[PDB]
């Protein structure tokens with residue numbers, strides 16, 4: 001019986017889709033590689049050639065021979081996967097009986113570490129396993145072909161009969177990322193980390209009008225063309241996977257809920273004296289504690305937790321929750337990246353006072369940098385939230401009006417004062433332009449359950465520009481800066497400034513800090 005001849009089929013590997021940036025610059029490119037395999041049965045008839053073959057494969061001669069001897073019953077084994085076709089011709093030129101070639105693909109990432117987290121990485125079988133390569137793996141993968149052959153009883157192909165199914169190439173994908181901005185962000189976030197002795201950071205830039213992520217960088221990063229180091233922490237796309245309490249950066253949302261309530265206008269006053277406010281066993285405290293009456297703008301400039309808490313008590317937590325929820329804090333982004341973290345927005349039927357206050361000033365909720373950026377985008381886009389995209393958006397979908405345009409425009413103006421006013425976040429200023437935003441500084445949560453860390457902080461800045469017709473929103477998060485100056489306004493705001501200055505000019509956005517006509 002057995003099988004004198006035997007009809008078998010083999011997979012024809014499909015070319016993986018090119019990934020570009022939004023201008024067509026290549027970011028992931030399928031590279032023809034040569035994979036060498038062998039038929040041990042056929043090898044058994046040319047043992048005299050093995051030691052030269054082992055040498056060519058950088059293998060110990062005995063270990064190589066042991067490997068073939070032990071796999072002698074098999075008909076297929078890899079010798080080496082993915083060599084350059086030039087390396088592959090070297091071994092093919094030995095002309096060893098039983099040694100054969102297949103054309104595979106392997107990705108090359110021309111921008112390397114600069115866009116590694118966003119673009120991602122493929123596994124040994126050319127499948128996506130992080131970032132866009134994973135999120136769009138079915139678009140990018142195409143469909144393998146099917147080639148029909150005849151094989152003898154000891155595994156040797158006797159002829160190519162025909163292609164029963166043609167391989168179908170995967171399709172091109174243009175990201176929303178602009179590599180010019182991505183490089184600028186990458187460089188300035190790296191510099192800031194190093195300058196501050198920080199442990200990690202993220203920086204997201206978004207188009208407020210289109211929902212597009214124009215830049216997304218994290219430190220530490222890695223070189224996805226280096227398939228050896230296997231360093232899982234440097235591979236974390238922190239902007240999408242590492243949640244944090246946003247702190248004072250959510251106060252503009254609390255204020256939006258205050259203005260929409262009917263009960264508050266920007267010139268109304270809150271008494272924040274003496275810088276603390278006792279709520280049962282918890283004490284709300286401000287960092288700076290030499291104020292009494294502050295107007296709502298001043299509450300933001302001084303970043304008074306006490307002031308925002310008194311407003312929260314007056315309007316109720318439900319209104320604040322609703323704004324936060326509607327702008328996307330702790331909510332699914334829709335981006336469909338496996339392993340993206342949603343974080344958490346807490347909810348109550350009856351909010352207690354402490355939960356009410358801490359929510360209003362940014363504790364007891366966990367967000368991602370992408371969420372935070374999208375929320376600022378909505379605010380900047382006169383209160384309209386356009387769906388987030390990591391792919392280039394040619395036709396913009398309808399956004400959802402999540403904050404009224406009048407309230408969002410009032411809040412814009414207040415954030416411009418936060419940047420421009422005396423005692424504000426002057427380091428976030430963008431020469432030539434009107435910029436707007438909000439600093440934060442949060443103690444990190446302690447890892448052994450419990451409470452909060454004494455000496456360890458996260459520094460934040462979130463903002464947009466130009467104030468008079470916003471185009472770009474940005475979030476800068478730096479984890480555990482190490483110098484005496486650790487506040488968001490010191491550490492993160494100058495990154496915002498430098499990156500907004502370049503980004504606006506790369507986008508040919510006209511300077512708006514002009515005379516009055």
Ligand SMILES: CCN1CCN(C(=O)N[C@@H](C(=O)N[C@H](C=O)[C@@H]2N[C@@H](C(=O)O)C(C)(C)S2)c2ccccc2)C(=O)C1=O
Nearest residue numbers: 247248249287303358363439440441442443452487488489
């Ligand atoms: C829920 C308990 N729990 C947890 C942690 N926690 C907290 O980490 N507090 C920080 C805070 O108050 N941050 C505010 C908004 O971020 C203000 N804005 C900063 C900014 O603008 O950079 C600021 C000007 C430095 S103070 C803080 C404290 C100390 C130093 C710096 C910042 C609380 O307060 C708090 O009760």
